[PDB]
Amino acid sequence: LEYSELYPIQNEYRMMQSLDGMWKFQFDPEEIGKKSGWENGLPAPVSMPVPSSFADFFTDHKERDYCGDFWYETEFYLPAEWRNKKIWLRFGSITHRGTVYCNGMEITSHEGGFLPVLADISTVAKPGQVNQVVVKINNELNETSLPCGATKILGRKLAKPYFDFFNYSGLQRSVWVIALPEESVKDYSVDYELCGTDALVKYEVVTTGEHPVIVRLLDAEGELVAETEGKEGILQVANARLWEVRNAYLYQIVILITDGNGVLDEYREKIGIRTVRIEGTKILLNDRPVYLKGFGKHEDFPILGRGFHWGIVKRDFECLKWTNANCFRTSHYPYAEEWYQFADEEGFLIIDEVPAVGMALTVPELLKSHIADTEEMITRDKNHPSVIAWSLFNEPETITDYAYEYFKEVFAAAETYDFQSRPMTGAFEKNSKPELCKCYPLCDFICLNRYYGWYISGGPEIEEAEELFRDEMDRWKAKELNVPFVFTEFGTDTMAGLHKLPSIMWSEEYQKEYLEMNFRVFDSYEFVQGELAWNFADFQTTEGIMRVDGNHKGVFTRDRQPKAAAVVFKDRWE
Amino acid sequence: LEYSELYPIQNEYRMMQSLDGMWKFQFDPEEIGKKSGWENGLPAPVSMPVPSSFADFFTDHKERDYCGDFWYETEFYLPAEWRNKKIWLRFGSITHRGTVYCNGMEITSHEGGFLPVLADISTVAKPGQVNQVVVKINNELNETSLPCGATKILNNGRKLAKPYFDFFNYSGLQRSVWVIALPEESVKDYSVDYELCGTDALVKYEVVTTGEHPVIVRLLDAEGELVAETEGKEGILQVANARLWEVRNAYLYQIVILITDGNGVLDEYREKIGIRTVRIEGTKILLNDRPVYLKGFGKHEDFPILGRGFHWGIVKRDFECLKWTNANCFRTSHYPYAEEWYQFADEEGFLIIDEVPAVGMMRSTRNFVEALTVPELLKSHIADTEEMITRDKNHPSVIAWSLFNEPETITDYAYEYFKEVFAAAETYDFQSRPMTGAFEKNSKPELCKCYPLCDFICLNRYYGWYISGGPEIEEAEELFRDEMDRWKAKELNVPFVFTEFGTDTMAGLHKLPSIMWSEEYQKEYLEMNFRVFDSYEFVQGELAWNFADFQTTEGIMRVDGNHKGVFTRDRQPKAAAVVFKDRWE
């Protein structure tokens, strides 16, 4: 990559300053901003919180549903001391695609709305002065970038997703301006081997120069436990304190660039010594089988939309721990980096998912976008101990040799980017029948999204649903694939407060009964090794006749309170 | 004050770095932290978001309801280039009281949970190194500090807050925290006051600095163009063809305050201000020499999960909802809000009644839930008043100070108490703008001794809810008119603003005919209240209780908090919201 994905830190060599706050903001329905000098400042802005999705602040439909080009602007004072450092704007994300300007100059553009955007403003930055950043953003959906959809023209544009979740957009994550030394740590990778009571931390370091590198490992108390020299090497850890499920331990890696007797740069990050591998039908963490228990989530909260906030992280993890979960999938896009940092702390397992949802010649361009997002996700997230698997798709077509050749390239790219070569998978929709699917052989383990008892034979037909479920799982069993299966979606829309005896679809009681039936099926097959329910919480969707204020398959409400079924998960996962 | 209330800025002379994020946090039920050295680091912390109230993250009662001592900790890297600066920790607030430590050393303590806490760490700060901050906080309620309440001790030693007020006892680090660096000689405070002279305006000012060097004051218009300049720590800026700050039509100048030594500039403070005058004339509230009728709400700092935690997103949604109702005003019930609320009101042209947390001074609810505590309470009350006014005086949005909410007012003792508060407020406010407080119904026109202290009178009344609700609503209207006729007959010639009126209203509860708690009853109640308001010339404002449903202590009279919101807690309109929109249009 032409930039670093490394999370920004502050020390003797690296500086950072937050640009979060109220930005200037303006819609550009006529698409004349770049024609009209907007990159030098917006002509008639309103204020817009950053980080946040813009949609749910407004009281009018056309602003909430805005689709097209729209602009952000802010000003920041740059400390004079940042002079002659490499100065970067770092956006947690820009959703979905955008062009960054600084002091009237075009800096960079990015496609993909859920991963960091880095813009090198070294040559245009004005140390000791007020600087200006302007971002042109677009939130349309197409079939050549992720996530896929269409754009309808009423000249007013309307996003038409091929995915369920609401098309939130804007500057949904924190924005920093940072300063790095001229020769810096750009990237590093760690991989682990367990040796009795000891451990090896294998590493590679990429810098922007040719000076020597020293790598140190500190324990949780900051004590030096290992040290070595070189951009490539092994850190030997005696009596290693392994990072364990729901029982984290984090070391601190310290990467130094040196020039004789002085340090040029120093990067530090918390990491966790752990191994993950698929062995037969088992998922092994540190050589012991683990059964995944948890949820698909979303970045979704009232008013903020996908806007990041530590308070949402904290509540969600307390709820997760209360259910006795150990895992979540980042459905259906990489989350803010902070979610992974916290999962590292709390010992949660993550399946990290690229926004390959909603899946013509456009396909070669789509593949490029999909591979680019995969590269960025893996480079960003590989050193989190929590991240134990990559999900490279959600419910694509998989039953043609055409689909096979496409995903072969994606998986091949993912493999080259992940230093750890940790398990890769994808979530299969029901149409990927065991007799037809061509893509499951690409996977280290198989993830199934199934709604037997909701979309199939729901309600009075739920007994039929269970037989149909068992019939499919019997077909999978007969294949003797010798791989683990994880259910990554299953659930029922459930309106909090809707009670019925006997239960009906949409009642709290039916949600319980549906889950109990699914558990019976899960527990009937030895090779099922994980259950991640859909969804952790009710979340916003495109409005329509099938969505009663978003998706109500949450086990929790949108404001994070338990429906009756939450207790069912709690008791089972205990 | 021994510190500056000025909002932090980033420029050539002043630096700031946010400490917001995930802090370490630990409850201290046995109160052993200090003797155990926790100021050097918490021994078994959990993670806690800052800014946020801590209560609503947890899944267990005892953590949510925790009352007593609890501790926060974080670490930060201090840029080497901050050496030879004055270095301060600035907490937007610390709720309710706390002691700030830095690098293991006690720095300062503060009482009052809703105003900035400044800690001078200059003598212990380590530039070019990681530094540590640890804060011991306490969230108990008592009768010698604001807001008032009691602390109950359960048989097993566990403490439980017992407020004398109807808002949940949220606490912790609810606002942003910065570490900042100032020049050794800096602008510490300034005040502006306005006079209108035809098409022109005068900006009278005072500047307080921490030194003796000369001061230069400039005023820039909204385009950054210089419109006035003068010299001296006291002076007058002459603005030709002034663009006044108007209700729901803001215009903001930028004041620029420079400290110089001739050779160069030592400090430069900048803030947006709005040229506007506020006065009471007879029964009229005059903004810029024209009557304004206040339309809006009492609010709260309250949102799901975050509690009172500050977030710009909440500000933005709330102001969009306010504008949609055609409101022009809110009261900061019942405590000063985060500074950002006022910054945004300035921008949006909203009027604010800024309220000190003098709530819970009602004898009835105290007894339900003194000679020696009242003198100490007065001191706390006056201190909070001084801090609020010093912090907020230069906002064009702030047009009035509310110095109490529903205290006892019918004794001569209460008069002497509030006489001192109002006297203090007057001396701290350079503008001497209107002062008021909100009166409960027990403050009968025949008995109240304190309303003469006010420049305009704010009434909290619930005729049709607590008094003669539902089938008796006709009687409620009669009783309401009876009281207002008594006020009318006093011919006080001052404006009256209703600062509370409303009904608990469950979203989705519909009934025909309406019942108390239904959406339809909220509408009917409001219509009845409007009919009464509109019958009296001297009524010049209506601020409904409340903007949005909000959290309270749980109990038999609170169904998941207070439901008198016109909006839900997640900021969506009940049926009554349109009633306000249509009326205020």
Angstrom CA distances, B498 to A117, B141, B186, B322, stand at 51, 28, 42, 18
Q: A266 near A256, Cβ under 8 Å?
A: yes
Alpha helices in A323-458 (DSSP H): 337-346, 363-381, 401-417
A47 touches chain B (CB under 8 A): yes
Q: A455 near A468, Cβ under 8 Å?
A: no
Angle (CA) B350-B352-B357 rounded to 5° is 150
- From chain B, the residues in CB contact with A18 under 8 A are 18
Residues B173, B37 share a domain: yes
In chain B, residues preceding a discontinuity (C to N beyond 2.5 A) are 369
CA–CA min distance B58, chain A (Å): 6
Tokens for B118, please give them.
């400044």
Contact at CB, A49 and B323, closer than 8 angstroms: no
- How far apart CA A350 and CA A245 sit, in angstroms, is 11
Q: A573 near A293, Cβ under 8 Å?
A: yes
CA–CA min distance B103, chain A (Å): 17
Amino acid identity, residue A93? S
B48, B313, B323 ranked by CB distance to A304: nearest: B313
Angstrom CA distances, B152 to A268, B32, B66, B409, B561, stand at 47, 20, 12, 27, 21
- From chain B, the residues in CB contact with A128 under 8 A are 12
Alpha helices in B106-200 (DSSP H): none
The single residue of B271, B355, B386, B406 carrying the catalytic annotation is B406
SS3 labels along B360-398 = CCCHHHHHHCCCCCHHHHHHHHHHHHHHHHHHHCCCCCE
Q: B51 near B173, Cβ under 8 Å?
A: yes
- How far apart CA A1 and CA B486 sit, in angstroms, is 78
Angstrom CA distances, A162 to A153, A404, A456, B497, stand at 16, 21, 21, 53
Residue A455 assigned as binding residue: yes
- How far apart CA A301 and CA A56 sit, in angstroms, is 10
- From chain A, the residues in CB contact with B344 under 8 A are 22, 47
The DSSP code for B567 is B
Closest CA to B112 of B16, B1, B208, B188: B1
Q: Is A183 exposed, middle or buried (0-12, 13-18, 19+ CB in 10 A)?
A: middle
Closest CA to A251 of A270, A264, A232: A270
Is B554 contained in some domain?
yes
Contact at CB, B58 and A313, closer than 8 angstroms: no
- How far apart CA A90 and CA A19 sit, in angstroms, is 10
Q: B168 near B561, Cβ under 8 Å?
A: yes
Contact at CB, B59 and A314, closer than 8 angstroms: no
Experimental technique used?
X-ray
Across the beta sheet with A175-180, the strand order is A15-18, A175-180, A86-91, A117-120
Residues 6+ apart with CB under 8 A from B500: B298, B438, B459, B460, B461, B462, B543, B544, B545
Residue that finishes a domain, picked among B132, B153, B182 = B182
- From chain A, the residues in CB contact with B323 under 8 A are 59
Interface test with A, best of B11, B59, B269, B578 (most A CBs within 10 A): B59
Other Cβ atoms closer than 10 A to B570 = 17
Interface test with A, best of B76, B312, B319, B322 (most A CBs within 10 A): B312
SS3 labels along A128-190 = CCEEEEEEEEECCCCCCCCCCEEEEECCCEEEEECCCECCCCECCCCEEEEEECCCCEEEEEE
- From chain B, the residues in CB contact with A309 under 8 A are 49, 306, 311
Is B8 contained in some domain?
no
Residue A23 assigned as binding residue: no
**Coil, strand, or helix at residue B16?**
strand
Interface test with A, best of B12, B13, B317 (most A CBs within 10 A): B317
Across the beta sheet with B117-120, the strand order is B15-18, B177-182, B86-91, B117-120
- How far apart CA B165 and CA B178 sit, in angstroms, is 30
Q: Is the peptide bond before B147 cis (omega within 30 degrees of 0)?
A: yes
Burial A31-56, CB ≥16 within 10 A → b, else e: eebeeeebbeebeebbbbbbbbbbbb
Residues A240, A161 share a domain: no
Q: Is the peptide bond before A434 cis (omega within 30 degrees of 0)?
A: no
B47, B323, B570 ranked by CB distance to A303: nearest: B570
Interface test with B, best of A303, A339, A346 (most B CBs within 10 A): A303
Burial B454-483, CB ≥16 within 10 A → b, else e: bbbbbbbbbbbbebbbbeebeebbebbbeb
Residues B219, B113 share a domain: no
CATH code, domain with B436: 3.20.20.80
Amino acid identity, residue A318? E
Other Cβ atoms closer than 10 A to A518 = 24
Q: B57 near B171, Cβ under 8 Å?
A: no
Is B131 contained in some domain?
yes
CA–CA min distance B12, chain A (Å): 6
Contact at CB, A302 and B306, closer than 8 angstroms: no
Q: A496 near A558, Cβ under 8 Å?
A: no
Tokens for B319, please give them.
């102001």
φ and ψ at residue A112, rounded to 5 degrees: 125, 120
**Coil, strand, or helix at residue B356?**
coil
The DSSP code for B285 is E
Q: B125 near B102, Cβ under 8 Å?
A: yes
Catalytic residues of A: 395, 489
Is A537 contained in some domain?
yes
Residues B287, B253 share a domain: no
In chain A, residues preceding a discontinuity (C to N beyond 2.5 A) are 154, 359
Residues A162, A32 share a domain: yes
**Inter-axis angle of helices A310-322 and A337-346, nearest 10:** 40
Amino acid identity, residue B380? S
Domain boundaries, position B209: 187-278
- How far apart CA B482 and CA B532 sit, in angstroms, is 10
Residues A539, A443 share a domain: yes
B80 touches chain A (CB under 8 A): yes
A302, A310, A560 ranked by CB distance to B22: nearest: A310
- How far apart CA A102 and CA A372 sit, in angstroms, is 25
CA–CA min distance A315, chain B (Å): 5
- How far apart CA A248 and CA A350 sit, in angstroms, is 13
Which long-range contacts does B285-293 make (Cβ < 8 Å, 24+ apart)? B285/B399, B285/B434, B285/B456, B285/B495, B285/B540, B285/B541, B287/B246, B287/B247, B287/B351, B287/B399, B288/B196, B288/B244, B288/B245, B288/B246, B289/B196, B291/B540, B292/B247, B292/B328, B292/B351, B292/B540, B293/B540, B293/B541
- How far apart CA A357 and CA A362 sit, in angstroms, is 16
B534 touches chain A (CB under 8 A): no
Indicate the annotated binding residues of B for beta-D-glucuronate: 166, 334, 405-406, 466, 500, 545, 558, 562, 564
B223 touches chain A (CB under 8 A): no
Residue that finishes a domain, picked among A152, A180, A208 = A180
Contact at CB, A304 and B321, closer than 8 angstroms: no
- From chain A, the residues in CB contact with B15 under 8 A are 79
The single residue of B500, B519, B524, B542 carrying the catalytic annotation is B500
CATH code, domain with A175: 2.60.120.260
Residues A126, A254 share a domain: no
Tokens for B88, please give them.
């301060």
- Give CA torsion, residues A142, A148, A154, A157, to 10 deg: -70
Helix (H) or strand (E) holding B46: strand B46-50
- How far apart CA B12 and CA B9 sit, in angstroms, is 10
Residues 6+ apart with CB under 8 A from B331: B296, B297, B298, B299, B352, B353, B355, B402, B438, B499, B543
Closest CA to B442 of B474, B466, B472: B466
- From chain B, the residues in CB contact with A345 under 8 A are 47
Residues B259, B171 share a domain: no
**Coil, strand, or helix at residue B565?**
coil
Residues A198, A165 share a domain: no
A17, A314, A560 ranked by CB distance to B49: nearest: A314
Torsion-angle region of B419 (φ positive above 0: left; ψ -120 to 50: alpha; else: beta): alpha
Tokens for B552, please give them.
């309270």
Residue that finishes a domain, picked among A225, A255, A271 = A271
Is A516 contained in some domain?
yes
Torsion-angle region of A459 (φ positive above 0: left; ψ -120 to 50: alpha; else: beta): left
Contact at CB, A310 and B21, closer than 8 angstroms: yes
Is A368 contained in some domain?
yes
Tokens for B209, please give them.
């600095």
Angstrom CA distances, A290 to A274, A277, A287, A325, A488, stand at 13, 11, 9, 12, 16
- From chain B, the residues in CB contact with A17 under 8 A are 10, 17
Residues B285, B214 share a domain: no
Closest CA to A182 of A267, A257, A255, A85: A85
Looking up tokens 């040796």 gives A195
Residues B244, B219 share a domain: yes
A63 touches chain B (CB under 8 A): no
The DSSP code for B414 is H
CATH code, domain with A202: 2.60.40.10
Torsion sign, CA atoms B284, B287, B292, B296 = negative
Is B1 contained in some domain?
no
Is A393 contained in some domain?
yes
Q: How far apart are the first and last CA of chain A?
A: 43
Burial A364-392, CB ≥16 within 10 A → b, else e: eebbebbbbbbbbbbbbbbbbbbbbbbbb
Tokens for A283, please give them.
């998922």
A404 touches chain B (CB under 8 A): no
Documented resolution in Å: 1.7
Other Cβ atoms closer than 10 A to A362 = 12
Q: Is B568 exposed, middle or buried (0-12, 13-18, 19+ CB in 10 A)?
A: middle
Interface test with B, best of A46, A314, A561 (most B CBs within 10 A): A314
A319 touches chain B (CB under 8 A): yes
φ and ψ at residue B340, rounded to 5 degrees: -60, -30
B312 touches chain A (CB under 8 A): yes
Contact at CB, A315 and B17, closer than 8 angstroms: no
Closest CA to A176 of A87, A95, A108: A87
CA–CA min distance B155, chain A (Å): 28
B321 touches chain A (CB under 8 A): yes
Other Cβ atoms closer than 10 A to B41 = 14
Closest CA to B576 of B531, B552, B544: B544
Q: How many domains does chain A have?
A: 3
A506 touches chain B (CB under 8 A): no
Contact at CB, B49 and A559, closer than 8 angstroms: no
Residues B322, B385 share a domain: yes
CA–CA min distance B551, chain A (Å): 14
